[PDB]
């Protein structure tokens with residue numbers, strides 16, 4: 225299990241910019257512009273444009289509030305008039321340079337519209353968002369705009385009994401089948417297009433009730449799925465339906481410890497400036513006995529692609545003679561491959577679209593959407609497993625250290641408004657710091673990263689507002705030792721400026737900078753006076769930031785024992801000399817000790833010169 | 839070897855509708871009960887249900903419908919059939935009566951009642967009039 229966050233930053237001790245509109249709640253949708261300087265917020269009954277560099281600067285505002293006759297219609301359907309019967313923005317996507325595509329629950333009448341960016345006024349397109357947007361603010365939902373066409377995963381109805389992964393195309397509308405083999409009680413988590421003869425694919429991530437597994441209760445299972453951008457459906461069968469829909473198990477577990485995380489919470493696509501293949505960073509929690517635990521598994525796209533392209537499918541079979549069981553299909557697979565895209569191979573066999581695929585192949589995919597092979601993580605284990613924390617959303621920044629060693633920086637939000645910064649150091653997790661983003665411990669519902677030159681920020685939304693944080697707080701570190709010991713690839717010590725700087729931001733010289741991810745503060749170069757009355761009591765204040773260090777006191781060059789009657793420890797860090805007399809005068813030193821590898825790192829926290837009067 | 843039942847009715851505009859009780863056939867993943875238009879705006883689109891006008895059942899092989907009769911009374915279409923009672927540990931085949939509003943195009947009003955004669959001593963329904 226991952227250790228405790230090395231340093232805890234109170235909302236008070238760091239520079240965090242906040243945004244909220246009075247009487248406006250549920251800041252669940254976040255979208256930043258092309259230029260990255262304008263962040264758009266989708267809340268309950270409102271859409272805003274804020275300066276992404278200072279979220280507190282409100283630029284534009286637009287509302288989409290529900291009428292009383294629509295609220296009462298919703299309430300008459302036994303829903304909560306002042307809770308669920310309101311317009312929760314669920315779809316906030318780029319449409320053009322001059323517009324956004326917006327959908328809201330709208331007292332259970334999913335409605336879509338175009339937000340005119342030049343005016344920040346809605347165009348009144350008033351489209352029926354049934355299938356595109358959920359009815360209930362409680363229902364799961366995911367959407368990705370690909371080539372001005374919305375690819376959405378949510379419920380097709382009011383009750384949330386009909387799930388749907390569909391494309392609102394207008395030219396070629398396509399949707400999933402309303403069948404258990406296709407989708408079995410899913411809870412949508414994330415979707416994105418993975419761009420390139422070879423066609424683009426639109427991946428979907430969700431948790432659904434498993435068909436392959438049987439246990440005491442119904443077992444959930446994380447799913448990775450994909451569809452082909454060029455899909456047009458089948459001609460005779462799969463009319464207006466996906467022909468390219470294949471899914472597989474997403475497995476996040478440490479078995480030598482019986483830890484299985486079968487509930488997917490978030491998915492982030494690490495788009496490597498260097499690496500040609502994207503890495504999905506997926507966030508999971510266990511369905512069973514969650515108390516709570518969180519795990520972060522990283523999946524190489526190539527792995528998943530290997531399953532969808534060459535993996536054996538699963539067959540459903542009748543078993544004695546009213547039951548259905550699912551097993552590996554070892555029978556003959558049709559050609560062209562069921563679920564495959566219109567690639568170079570297909571085009572050679574005179575196949576231009578799904579509309580001209582053989583009925584043999586189309587029937588196969590319709591009856592075999594599920595793959596036998598699981599999609600496994602890189603190094604076949606989670607990147608991080610944490611206890612006593614319920615992680616909510618994830619973002620990852622691939623950063624180059626001073627050394628040139630590349631670290632994948634994990635920003636993980638909690639259900640209590642906190643953000644953890646973690647890196648997988650040499651075969652062990654290091655949680656650099658934790659920051660309390662929300663003073664009200666509101667769970668971070670959404671998280672969004674901008675790693676772009678200048679505007680390097682993380683944006684977190686909750687029901688109470690939005691928070692803007694940098695990727696590091698290098699300046700909070702006082703000494704070179706403190707700067708190095710942090711083991712943050714973002715932070716380096718600058719001897720000329722006598723400040724711990726943010727490497728890859730500051731205008732300090734690279735060649736003349738200090739950073740050691742080993743934590744060996746050895747690479748570094750290197751008195752509060754008091755006058756108290758006789759008989760009186762002294763409180764010598766001492767504090768440090770490491771949650772992984774312990775402090776001890778020293779008087780007259782010896783390790784002082786804070787025991788009654790002469791001594792006491794107030795708050796485990798502040799020394800208390802009780803009965804002051806001639807001999808108590810002199811130097812009192814507060815020291816810290818923290819283990820890095822095998823070695824211990826002692827640091828002098830406080831220096832005190834106590835003088836007792838006569 | 840597998841029965842199909844039908845019922846010709848009218849829509850709200852007097853248009854001709856056909857209610858179908860298609861029993862499960864071992865591809866046949868077709869909904870067990872549907873409302874298909876007999877003569878729509880495009881006559882080439884006849885015998886099609888509106889994607890909404892069906893009884894979506896997720897595990898047809900398990901329920902294994904066996905239709906007997908379909909009929910109407912008042913503003914309702916009724917269906918007589920056998921299917922496995924999966925609520926029972928026995929998962930044994932049981933006789934049922936089914937009812938949907940003639941106007942209901944989403945099968946919202948659809949309701950099933952088990953039939954008993956006498957306390958299931960004669961469990962299998964064969965015919966009715």
Ligand SMILES: *[C@@H]1O[C@H](CO)[C@@H](O[C@@H]2O[C@H](CO)[C@@H](O[C@@H]3O[C@H](CO)[C@@H](O)[C@H](O)[C@@H]3O)[C@H](O)[C@H]2NC(C)=O)[C@H](O)[C@H]1NC(C)=O
Nearest residue numbers: 499500501502503522523524525526527528530601602603
């Ligand atoms: C994600 O999965 C892909 C799929 O294989 C990984 O890519 C491949 O990794 C192998 C392993 O070495 C590469 O093979 C060889 O690399 C050595 C190293 O220099 C080279 O000397 C050999 O001649 C050969 O090239 C293979 O080329 C490479 N292919 C691609 C497209 O990347 C990828 O590394 C995985 N990424 C992660 C983070 O797991």
Ligand SMILES: *[C@@H]1O[C@H](CO)[C@@H](O[C@@H]2O[C@H](CO)[C@@H](O[C@@H]3O[C@H](CO)[C@@H](O)[C@H](O)[C@@H]3O)[C@H](O)[C@H]2NC(C)=O)[C@H](O)[C@H]1NC(C)=O
Nearest residue numbers: 248249250251252268307308312360361362669686687688
């Ligand atoms: C949107 O944001 C608002 C802002 O907090 C959320 O409001 C909160 O709603 C919950 C209920 O869902 C309130 O909890 C209470 O639950 C008990 C249990 O029965 C009930 O008896 C109480 O009357 C109350 O409803 C919570 O107090 C309330 N917060 C505030 C400040 O009023 C809202 O739930 C969010 N909606 C979504 C979809 O996230």
Ligand SMILES: *[C@@H]1O[C@H](CO)[C@@H](O[C@@H]2O[C@H](CO)[C@@H](O)[C@H](O)[C@H]2NC(C)=O)[C@H](O)[C@H]1NC(C)=O
Nearest residue numbers: 322323338339340341342343344345346347348
């Ligand atoms: C989007 O909003 C802009 C903002 O007004 C609209 O711009 C006006 O467009 C008309 C022509 O249609 C011009 O005559 C006005 O002078 C424009 N005013 C401004 C301030 O630019 C634009 O038309 C809107 N787009 C749509 C589709 O409604």
Ligand SMILES: *[C@@H]1O[C@H](CO)[C@@H](O[C@@H]2O[C@H](CO)[C@@H](O)[C@H](O)[C@H]2NC(C)=O)[C@H](O)[C@H]1NC(C)=O
Nearest residue numbers: 319325351369372373374391392393394395397
């Ligand atoms: C969602 O589907 C609707 C259904 O057609 C699309 O609507 C058309 O939109 C185009 C402009 O993009 C208009 O020229 C057509 O006249 C519209 N037709 C109808 C029937 O609405 C809509 O654009 C789709 N939206 C997205 C984001 O894909």
Ligand SMILES: *[C@@H]1O[C@H](CO)[C@@H](O[C@@H]2O[C@H](CO)[C@@H](O)[C@H](O)[C@H]2NC(C)=O)[C@H](O)[C@H]1NC(C)=O
Nearest residue numbers: 509513514515516517611612613614615639640
């Ligand atoms: C982690 O999240 C779980 C829920 O997923 C929390 O468990 C709930 O805690 C509340 C607080 O009293 C209880 O009333 C609920 O009954 C609990 N539900 C379950 C399923 O246990 C858990 O406390 C959270 N723990 C941490 C460390 O975040």
Ligand SMILES: *[C@@H]1O[C@H](CO)[C@@H](O)[C@H](O)[C@H]1NC(C)=O
Nearest residue numbers: 241275277278279280281282
């Ligand atoms: C932007 O941030 C600065 C930093 O303190 C603040 O002084 C200024 O008022 C903020 N702008 C707005 C509109 O809040």
